[PDB]
Write a protein that binds this ligand. Structure first.
Ligand SMILES: Cc1ncc(C[n+]2csc(CCOP(=O)(O)OP(=O)(O)O)c2C)c(N)n1
Ligand SMILES: Cc1ncc(C[n+]2csc(CCOP(=O)(O)OP(=O)(O)O)c2C)c(N)n1
Ligand SMILES: [Mg+2]
Ligand SMILES: [Mg+2]
Lengths: 802, 802
């Protein structure tokens, strides 16, 4: 347990602390300007000239001084209260404020020993910001203190809230851009306070950085009336406080006193809410939130070239773009840097004076050092139940292809027991789909956590104010919550109807990018758990729905994250429940990954034993020898290959029929897609020799793909025998229809697959059989049209093992 | 002008109208149940048995009766007021309520003559819903009255608002699911009332379908306190009204009277707001919104098998799943269908009685017939300015590769003049990026429309309460607004930083799917204008930003929409401003497309004349003969190929150097990407013969790709000479850095390209030159590290034409 959580001060903030906070604000303002403008001479020692100014001025001043003000006050708070604290920088383009924070708290020099606490260190600190060979413009994962970069705006609040889940001692002041608040994901973010519990979760404090402006526009929230703004936050279940500063001549020390006193009122209320929640954990409190209304660019020159800058969108990027080039602009920069009076903040050796930091928290309470902001230092392996107890045993008992098992129900029972063994560190998220995707065996040991109105046990099944499943009809919220949950060292999984995974494609992009930078160059940031996503209710079996719900293409997005042997992405196609089991265990042991686990939820055949799934998963693709009828690759007329539960069922029925015709083939199943890539693009892929062995050197390959055929084609482009692959995939065809018709209109049904294989073997010899199969598909459809359900030859076919 | 907009009644709703509305509600409820459950015997004529019930029960009852209630009342409204009305069905899974509406209003039989107004027609109407060979489960584009399917929830409000833009006579009651309101995009949707003007735009009426439940959960909004709920909507600038019905024994006619009176109060206030806005168009009114709180599944059996159904999430999907199979369940269905007393609603011939519809609007005011809900019937071609006036003339005057032109500024001037010539039907949307992407020449003729607080001319440039540019920091809002703007027959464009286009990938998915169904099978739905998206501030030149802003992969998403010769997607890589011009004109004339127009905003060389861009765009790819030094394909040692402004600059510098070494090559530029596909996948692509001519039959091809190399590889997989293409693309490498370093770390810089070409020609002969180039890249980087800007050999290189 870190510090002394939820303690009130019961005295005023000291005058020493106010003094220190103004010194912090002035030094972090100064060094943020230095990071942006200065290539050398950080203390402006004589001669200080244009030659000290960066050739390329890049970065973001506007948000930065308001961030630095808040961080002064949050730091002061942490230290007075000994409060376990992680902040979120929504305006992540304010990167100098987060690097300045770490540098002041001492963690920057601890993590980066070359960036020393003295003039030479400070020169390097200024130069290196947004610079070739240096550091990023944003609150990147290489910044001690960051679990959120804030490059792609809108995830401030889901991360803040996922971080405090099952973290009752943790306090998260979440700085949100007022421009950011215009995004979709941020707007639904506010509603998370109905989904956390004030006894078992920690506390988020939304701080709205209402600086009036985004890039080139005012913001919506800053320009509505104050009464609308207050009604807004009250209507979302918060107690709003508003702070206004910086628009008149109020002196800075007065501003600090007033803000500290306000911030103490807000914290006191948080402490009262925490204390009350130990007794009453059912009443949802009105959590405080802070509206912080200060000028953009605060403390910068009011006008530059006769244009309003402080208190404007003009302050957004880099004021004085000509500081290197004119001398008019350099004089303004010099005066600006001087107004912070650095001669009072730095010792002659260029170290930051002791009296600038005496007020700062220390040790692991420092914002840069809290282990919650590097959660893999506190992550523990899950206590996993043995997989074998979950196996579908039907394959051993009756044969390959047996039964009508709904595959995710095995993952559900497994997840149930993981929750039981790890009761406060493994969460399930679902956009109102947990049950729909068949993971509700989990409710046998816990509830959907819901901290909002209850009506009746006749309607309110499987929910309680505390629990380890969270649902909200928002994919951004599910993915945001989980990411931060993982980033602070815990574990879990979510699920989503496959076509709607795309809502959060850009979230997968950013978390994959966080993972990339991390495995490449941040060894101090320890491994976190993986994002585990069950992609179910797939393209082929969206029976109550239709075309809008048919889009397996998150595959294609994920493929754009597969470089440089990072290995931060995996795409798995579970063939049935036993494959699902094998994949899930690997996923739950893995770290530093996004894992997409595709499985169908419909009743379906089970193809492999558990032991077989384990061996196959390990290699990535496997021959199914019990299904091949050819002896060796020379005897093979076609390779029958599959990835996907329905492509597989269809390929298998086709193989049954090709067998009965005396065609000689082999069956290859593919589970781990990226392992089809060449070793040169992927050092963990099948070797060429392994690839050739599976797929032959010179025989045609019929490949039935779950998603767009383009994926497999681009992936195998430098593989031997690639020109022989015929890839059949989803091709934007379907509607509200029978299971047979869905595969039919994509040429994915068994008859079409058979026909395709014939065409590849000898189109002339089998012209007639092909026609006959093409017509049988037409007859099977008409039969569905006329009767309301699929032709029994189709529905009732079970694989000949049995 | 349609009907008599914004007229008050000044009398009570008639008793005849209340009577009709209850008949509408009862008949649409009845027929919605019929669509879901009945394969035959729609009037339950003796014998009515289980054999009449669908074998596969699929569909969504829960939302449906509340929709049917609202539609009764909106229909009654339209007719009393002669009000130009389009509705939005947010809960688009309530498809039977929209098909029932069209069937009652008469448009279904007009558009689908086989679905007749009599027993035989009604049998077909019931059977065909969610059925093989029939119609979709959702409010699909084949439903007269639909401009929004509501399959992927969350876009109800952006569409509602984009529809009323520059549409002052149009009224849009927007039905939003209370589950839908939990999504990100819906939550920011509410804020659009700060972005429309009540004089020059029409009026949206948000109706929150607060039925208490989503799929398997209660909803956030239904379970907070009523006071929070009211504060919420008031805080977003609405006047909230609340209607509660259905939870007691209040008789239905009383419910209709009470609701009609409320709905009249709401409309009166809308009429007052409209009338006031003719004089005061600066004061933002508090638009009405309606909280409609009724039981899910309303009028269904209260309990089924001892489980609460009406007033529960259980009502969500298909109550009585066993209606075919038990007889216990069939008796319940029969009683349920009977409670609507259809013997009072249908004539003996099975036509709907006249007194059920006498209250209904007629002609083009009918919900199914309004041309706003099929906007291509009112769409007109834009009055386009001549392109030649915008040409960058530098290419003709000084040579290929001249100048430092910021390409989109030509599109900006063009857009400026399009707005001038079409002042109320062409809009620009930008997520706070219009200026950042260089389209602000548009503000020369109009303003960013902003209907919210103003502070000062010192900060509030280029904005006014009415205008034809709209910005909000939300990609969902930009894309939603535009889609509906196009769907109701107008035109426009938006722009977005490239990596953030992904926020709305799933929106592109749905609108592409709308387009697909439309071109394939809905000839009555006329062509609308295309979605035009400028994809700028690209991967290669995100100078103030870094890794989070580097992701050109919307390419890959778009490629998953390129089937069956729909031609609903285009991906264009503008090489410079003249190519941009040529592409933009084609885009602005096109229909029924999503067009992604990639262009760099950085200062950059201009490569082609306008006339050349026109010829090249038409073919899709072109040899640049003035750049080739080889005579014919036999003389060619490598094909130098490009798609992208920066890949192109880099390839050109490489070609300059390969020339000087006496290497013989050709230069192919690629603008229209999908035209690289085979004719078999794309009937408008380059012929194999055209392809071979550009790319040779047997020579290596160096392909410098703007985005992920996987895209080109999968696209050319069946093209002749494909195994000779070496595709270099973005590979997840970069940071906050120099322009040279960004291309360097992706092996995309000129030296790397040269080296690559050498390797393809003779790796052994040029081992030394390759090493030398690899080292020069290392030296150029160190130079950037040491000096703060790129090596002059790199920066100052201008193409030898000049
Ligand atoms: C999803 C997304 N869209 C667009 C951008 C482009 N962008 C970078 S900062 C910014 C404006 C930020 O304004 P605000 O959140 O108010 O922050 P401020 O700098 O005023 O603190 C925008 C539009 C982005 N970062 N993320
Ligand atoms: C973006 C998205 N995510 C998930 C779904 C899955 N889904 C289909 S309907 C539904 C619940 C809808 O509830 P609500 O909006 O309250 O509508 P109701 O049927 O009660 O009118 C969900 C979660 C979806 N359609 N869209
Ligand atoms: Mg702001
Ligand atoms: Mg609902």
């Amino acid at each position: 347990v870190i510090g002394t959580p939820w303690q009130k001060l019961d005295r005023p903030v000291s005058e020493e602390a106010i003094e220190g906070m103004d010194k912090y604000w002035r030094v972090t303002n100064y060094m943020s300007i230095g990071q942006i403008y200065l290539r050398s001479n950080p203390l402006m020692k004589e001669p200080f000239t244009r030659d000290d100014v960066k050739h390329r001025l890049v970065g973001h001043w506007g948000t930065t001084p308001g961030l630095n003000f808040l961080l002064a006050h949050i730091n002061r708070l942490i230290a007075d209260h000994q409060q376990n604290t992680v902040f979120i920088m929504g305006p992540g383009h304010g990167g100098p404020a987060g690097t300045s924070q770490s540098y002041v708290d001492g963690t920057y020099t601890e993590y980066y020993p070359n960036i020393t606490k003295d003039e030479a260190g400070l020169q390097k600190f200024f130069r290196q910001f947004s610079y070739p060979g240096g550091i990023p413009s944003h609150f990147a994962p290489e910044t001690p203190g960051s679990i959120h970069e804030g490059g792609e705006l809108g995830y401030a609040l889901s991360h803040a809230y996922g971080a405090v889940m099952n973290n009752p001692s943790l306090f998260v002041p979440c700085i949100i851009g007022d421009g950011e608040a215009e995004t979709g994901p941020l707007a639904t973010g506010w509603q998370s306070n109905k989904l956390v519990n004030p006894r078992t979760d920690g506390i988020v404090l939304p701080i709205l950085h209402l600086n009036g402006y985004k890039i080139a526009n005012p913001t919506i929230l800053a320009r509505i009336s104050d009464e609308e703004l207050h009604d807004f936050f009250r209507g979302m279940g918060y107690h709003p406080y508003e702070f206004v500063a910086g628009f008149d001549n109020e002196d800075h020390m007065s501003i600090h006193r007033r803000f500290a006193e306000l911030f103490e009122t807000i914290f006191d209320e948080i402490c009262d809410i925490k204390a009350a929640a130990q007794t009453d954990d059912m009443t949802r409190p009105f959590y405080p939130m802070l509206i912080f209304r200060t000028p953009k660019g605060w403390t910068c020159p009011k006008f530059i070239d006769g244009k309003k800058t402080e208190g404007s969108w003009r302050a957004h990027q880099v004021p004085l773009a000509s500081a290197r080039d004119t001398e008019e602009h350099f004089e303004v920069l010099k005066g600006w840097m001087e107004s912070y009076k650095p001669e009072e903040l730095f010792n002659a050796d260029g170290s930051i004076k002791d009296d600038v930091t005496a007020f700062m928290p220390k040790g692991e309470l420092r914002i840069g050092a809290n282990p919650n902001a590097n959660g893999g230092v506190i992550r523990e392996d899950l206590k996993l139940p043995e997989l074998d107890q979950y196996e579908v045993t039907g394959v051993k008992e009756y044969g390959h292809g047996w039964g009508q098992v709904e595959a995710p129900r095995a993952l559900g029972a497994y997840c149930r027991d993981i929750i039981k063994n790890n009761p406060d560190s493994f969460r399930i998220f679902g956009p109102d789909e947990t049950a729909s995707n068949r993971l509700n065996a989990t409710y046998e040991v816990t509830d959907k956590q819901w901290d909002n109105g209850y009506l009746s046990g006749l309607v309110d099944e499987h929910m309680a104010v505390t629990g380890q499943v969270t649902e909200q009809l928002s994919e951004h919220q599910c993915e945001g919550f989980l990411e931060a949950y993982l980033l602070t060292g815990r574990h879990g999984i979510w699920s989503s109807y496959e076509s709607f995974v795309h809502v959060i494609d850009s979230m997968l992009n950013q978390h994959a990018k966080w993972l990339e930078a991390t495995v490449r160059e941040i060894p101090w940031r320890k491994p976190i758990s993986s994002v585990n996503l069950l992609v179910s209710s797939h393209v082929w079996r969206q029976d109550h729905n239709g075309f809008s719900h048919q889009d397996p293409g998150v595959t294609s997005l994920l493929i754009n994250k597969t470089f440089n042997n990072d290995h931060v992405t995996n795409i798995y196609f579970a063939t049935d429940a036993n494959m699902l089991l094998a994949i899930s265990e690997k996923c739950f042991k893995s770290t530093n990954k996004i894992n997409a686990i595709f499985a169908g939820k419909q009743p379906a055949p089970t193809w492999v034993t558990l032991d077989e799934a384990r061996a196959e998963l390990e290699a990535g693709a496997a021959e199914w020898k019990w299904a091949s009828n050819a002896e060796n690759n020379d005897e093979v007329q076609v390779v029958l290959a599959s990835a996907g539960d329905v492509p597989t069922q269809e390929l298998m029925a086709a193989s049954d029929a090709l067998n009965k015709m005396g065609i000689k083939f082999k069956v290859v199943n593919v589970v781990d897609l990226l392992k089809l890539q060449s070793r040169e693009n992927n050092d963990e892929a099948l070797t060429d020799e392994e690839f050739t062995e599976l797929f032959t050197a010179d025989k045609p390959v019929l490949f039935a793909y779950h998603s767009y055929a383009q994926d497999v084609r681009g992936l195998i482009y430098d593989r031997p025998n690639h020109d022989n692959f015929h890839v059949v995939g989803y091709k934007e065809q379907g509607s509200t229809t029978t299971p047979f018709d869905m595969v039919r209109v994509n040429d994915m049904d068994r008859y079409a697959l058979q026909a395709a294989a014939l065409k590849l073997i000898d189109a002339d010899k089998y012209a007639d059989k092909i026609d006959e199969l093409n017509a049988f598909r037409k007859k099977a459809f008409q039969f569905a049209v006329d009767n309301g359900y699929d032709i029994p030859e189709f529905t009732d076919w079970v694989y000949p093992d049995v």
